Structure 1
């Protein structure tokens, strides 16, 4: 099945100038935990902000342009990206904006982190139809010494 994983601040903001303004060590631990040993699909911009292959996962990048690093897999369309994953139980789509928009309809599960932070950005998470989704897991956390804002980890399943 296909799942989307993402961190959103106020207003569904997900990035600004090809980067994520905040720093939340706990959220990144959660991201790694949920994606390790699974294939991750990302768009070219995202590949670029990340700057290197994510270890322990098959990294698949979507680009209309030919590949430029053999350490990852390059695909030119959504169907090929999905076929490149092979037979696995869960495929993780990691963004960015344009790529989330294209996979949303095909996704059965969303792993969202809501962050209490007001950031002015240029990329947003798609505006999905709440009706259609069921929250099956929620876990709130106040801010602390290592994490600058409070956040909520949530998992939705398409009804």
Structure 2
């Protein structure tokens, strides 16, 4: 099935013009752990902020314009993105906001990191109804010497 994985501040904020004001290596380990050896679909702006192909994963970039890096797969529509994943057990949609909006109604699983931070952003994760989603996993973590904020990992499966 199709899964979304995202990290959210309060008010569903996921992005802004400048780098996010936090340092959460534990969330990136969580991200890597849950995306490895799966196709990852991302929008062009997410691709540019990552800056490199994510190793160990089939990288699929959505863009209206021709691709600029043959190390990854470039697609011009949501249907082309899905087609490029082939027949696999799980497809990982890793952002950004515009991409999440289009894939959420197709998704069966959400991997959400809830960050205890308030950040004015220009991009938000879509609003979802708890009645449509069962919380199957939830784990809270304090901030520590390596992580600037407290956070919790949650996995939801569509009802």
Per the alignment, in what secondary structure is the counterpart of residue 111 of structure 1?
Answer: strand
Corresponding residue number in structure 2 for 1:139: 139
Per the normalisation by structure 2, the TM-score is 0.97
Larger mean CA deviation between 12-21 and 97-106 belongs to 12-21
How far apart are the structure 2 equivalents of 1:61 and 1:125?
19
Q: Deviations over 1:53-86 (max 9, x none)?
A: 0000000000010111101000000011001001
How far apart are the structure 1 equivalents of 2:99 and 2:132?
20
Cα displacement (A) at 1:129:
1.5
Cα displacement (A) at 1:142:
0.8
Cα displacement (A) at 1:18:
5.7
Distance change (3 Å), C-alpha of 1:105 and 1:64: same
**How many residues are treated as equivalent by the alignment?**
158
Distance change (3 Å), C-alpha of 1:84 and 1:98: same
Corresponding residue number in structure 1 for 2:116: 116
Corresponding residue number in structure 2 for 1:49: 49
Cα displacement (A) at 1:119:
0.9
RMSD: 0.8
Q: Deviations over 1:7-49 (max 9, x none)?
A: 0011110011164332101000000000000000000110111
How far apart are the structure 2 equivalents of 1:18 and 1:79?
31
Q: Contact 1:18/1:46 (CA < 8 Å) preserved in 2?
A: no
How far apart are the structure 2 equivalents of 1:112 and 1:133?
12
